[PDB]
Design a protein around this nucleic acid. Structure first.
Ligand SMILES: [Mg+2]
Lengths: 98, 121, 117
DNA sequence: CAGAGGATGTGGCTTC
DNA sequence: GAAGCCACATCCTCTG
């Protein structure tokens, strides 16, 4: 599926969760699927670096993530300043049929 | 006017009508974004009321039907098990599986109403 | 507004543009005209017909006849027609009995409204 | 102000 | 290769 060839967000984002060196800008939160957002504007700044989009900020990146909701890719941790979580149980139905 | 003057001519001339004169591939168009279980209940509950939304898949032509002037000859669920048996473009004209929500139908020129309607002029 | 022919010469509708984006506020809201006297209150629904996805998803698809003219607040085309292909959309008029006017080569529904390529 | 979300242009990418 | 897709880009909008 075209997640392999062309770079996504959730694909790109998790380059940084699993990588211990980039814990400066993000980290997993607990056993269950959850993640923090350390430097919200730096997070974006690198997403801009990759997307060749220097203008990029959080507000821009963020929206794209708020699409994911309706698609069942990830969801929000309600109230928590910059904390969402992945719907893997869905990613596979979204990467394979049933 | 409600109908065209040459009511019989149009049905037996127009490409549109003769394409739907033969028994063609039809399917239920109602509630496309709903699960297979719900669609089966809605379609059947509608047929009994005397209405539905069927389209000729081959051509694309969609329709909303009314089986009326409850009814006997218009909607019949007894003819076979697991299935059931207007003025189009100014021309008076007249089965689906209860599990698959697909089957076969067609148009037929209404000689009865084409005289009744043309008389109103 | 500007009108166009139908397959029923008893009813006429808006000039829905050539090619438009998947679910967009239409550039000119949909006007359906009744030349034969229709009771101002009768409902008028539409169904997008095409060999591909025979019944596409539509929004604000139902409207109310008023002063012999049914206006669709803002109809929107969700289900795409495909490459080159366009909808032969069906136009119902809930009466006893109902009447329809088919409309071939109505509009081309893609994910892009035609850009400068 | 973050957070959900309608609108609408954008650019890389498969498909005729 | 224009013609359909695609998955964000940019945008301004409300409201808790
Ligand atoms: Mg707006």
């Amino acid at each position: 599926m075209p997640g392999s060839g062309q770079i996504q967000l959730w694909q790109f984002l998790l380059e940084l969760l699993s990588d211990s060196s980039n814990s400066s800008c993000i980290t997993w939160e607990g056993t269950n699927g959850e993640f923090k957002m350390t430097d919200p504007d730096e997070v974006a700044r690198r997403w801009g670096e990759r997307k060749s989009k220097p203008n990029m900020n959080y507000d821009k990146l963020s929206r794209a993530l708020r699409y994911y909701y309706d698609k069942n890719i990830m969801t929000k941790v309600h109230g928590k300043r910059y904390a969402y979580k992945f719907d893997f149980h869905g990613i596979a139905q979204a990467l394979q049929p049933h | 006017p409600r109908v065209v003057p040459d009511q019989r001519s149009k049905f037996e001339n127009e490409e549109f009508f003769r394409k739907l004169s033969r028994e063609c591939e039809i399917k239920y168009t109602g509630f496309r974004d709903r699960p297979h279980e719900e669609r089966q209940a809605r379609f059947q509950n509608a047929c009994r009321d005397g209405r539905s939304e069927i389209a000729f898949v081959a051509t694309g032509t969609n329709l909303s039907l009314q089986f009326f002037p409850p009814s006997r000859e218009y909607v019949d669920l007894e003819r076979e098990a697991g299935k059931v048996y207007m003025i189009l473009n100014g021309v008076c004209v007249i089965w689906i599986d209860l599990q698959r929500l697909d089957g076969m139908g067609c148009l037929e020129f209404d000689e009865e109403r084409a005289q009744q309607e043309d008389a109103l002029a | 507004a500007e009108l166009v022919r139908t397959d029923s010469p008893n009813f006429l509708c808006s000039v829905l543009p050539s090619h438009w984006r998947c679910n967009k506020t239409l550039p000119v809201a949909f006007k359906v005209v009744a030349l034969g006297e229709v009771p101002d209150g009768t409902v008028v629904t539409v169904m997008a017909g095409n060999d591909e996805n025979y019944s596409a998803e539509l929004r604000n698809a139902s409207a109310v006849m008023k002063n012999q003219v049914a206006r669709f607040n803002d109809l929107r085309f969700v289900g795409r027609s495909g490459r080159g292909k366009s909808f032969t959309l069906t136009i119902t008029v809930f009466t006893n009995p109902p009447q329809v006017a088919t409309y071939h080569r109505a509009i081309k529904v893609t994910v892009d409204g035609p850009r400068e390529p």
